[PDB]
Amino acid sequence: MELIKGQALFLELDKKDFLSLKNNDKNIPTFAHPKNQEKILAIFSLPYKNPPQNTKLIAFYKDKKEEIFIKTLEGNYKSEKLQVENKKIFPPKTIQERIAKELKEANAIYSSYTPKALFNGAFNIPLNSFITSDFGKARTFNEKVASYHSGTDFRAATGTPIYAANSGVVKIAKDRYFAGNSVVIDHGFGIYSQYYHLSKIDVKVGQKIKKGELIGLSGASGRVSGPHLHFGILAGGKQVDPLDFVSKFNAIFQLEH
Numbered sequence: 001m002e003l004i005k006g007q008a009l010f011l012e013l014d015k016k017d018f019l020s021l022k023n024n025d026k027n028i029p030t031f032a033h034p035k036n037q038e039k040i041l042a043i044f045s046l047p048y049k050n051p052p053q054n055t056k057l058i059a060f061y062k063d064k065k066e067e068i069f070i071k072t073l074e075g076n077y078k079s080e081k082l083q084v085e086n087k088k089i090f091p092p093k094t095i096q097e098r099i100a101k102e103l104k105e106a107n108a109i110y111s112s113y114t115p116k117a118l119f120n121g122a123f124n125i126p127l128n129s130f131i132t133s134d135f136g137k138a139r140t141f142n143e144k145v146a147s148y149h150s151g152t153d154f155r156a157a158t159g160t161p162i163y164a165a166n167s168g169v170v171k172i173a174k175d176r177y178f179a180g181n182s183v184v185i186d187h188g189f190g191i192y193s194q195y196y197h198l199s200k201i202d203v204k205v206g207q208k209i210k211k212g213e214l215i216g217l218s219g220a221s222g223r224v225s226g227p228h229l230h231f232g233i234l235a236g237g238k239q240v241d242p243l244d245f246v247s248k249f250n251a252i253f254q255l256e257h
């Protein structure tokens with residue numbers, strides 16, 4: 001198999017007699033295939049930064065051992081230049097403790113695995129506009145700082161209503177330094193959707209949010225070159241191309257009336 005860095009894969013395996021799926025020492029969780037009762041699924045993601053060049057997954061059965069080899073592809077990401085406030089790429093010392101806390105809080109949330117579906121069928125795009133800055137663009141801020149784009153930016157004037165991409169439970173709903181006013185939703189199975197730089201937040205941490213329900217209004221909070229919506233997906237432990245993830249998720253989990 002081959003996978004572009006920064007993307008996720010849905011691996012399909014036989015359910016009968018399955019014992020465990022591992023990458024080196026780490027167990028990869030599994031969930032049921034919603035249509036094919038003979039299959040299970042797992043999410044495998046490659047990080048954009050510093051992925052391994054090759055991966056060997058091992059699936060253990062009562063009477064089989066299966067090695068799956070996935071080659072990391074570099075993809076065809078392009079570069080872009082962005083102008084932001086100098087303090088948003090070199091923050092003052094008075095603020096770096098808050099940045100430390102916020103990163104520790106998020107790490108704790110993304111490691112909190114929910115082993116059931118909190119979603120309801122397919123994801124919707126949370127904004128009906130167009131892409132202004134695609135995933136994985138190699139960035140330079142102020143001709144000083146290299147970065148990469150860990151989500152996808154949609155055109156949005158300040159105050160555009162932002163709706164939940166799928167059903168889930170709110171895990172973050174507060175102003176953070178770099179992401180601005182941030183909303184993060186746990187959808188189960190380690191899938192989290194993220195909405196950044198909002199001007200207003202309409203939910204609270206712990207809330208059960210339904211697909212298509214209002215979660216806030218877009219804005220220009222945090223590290224921005226101007227007003228927009230930033231949409232992100234974390235799955236399989238990593239930030240992945242959100243619209244690629246949604247297409248792959250929806251092929252499996254979409255429903256009909």
Ligand SMILES: [Zn+2]
Nearest residue numbers: 151152153230
């Ligand atoms: Zn963005």
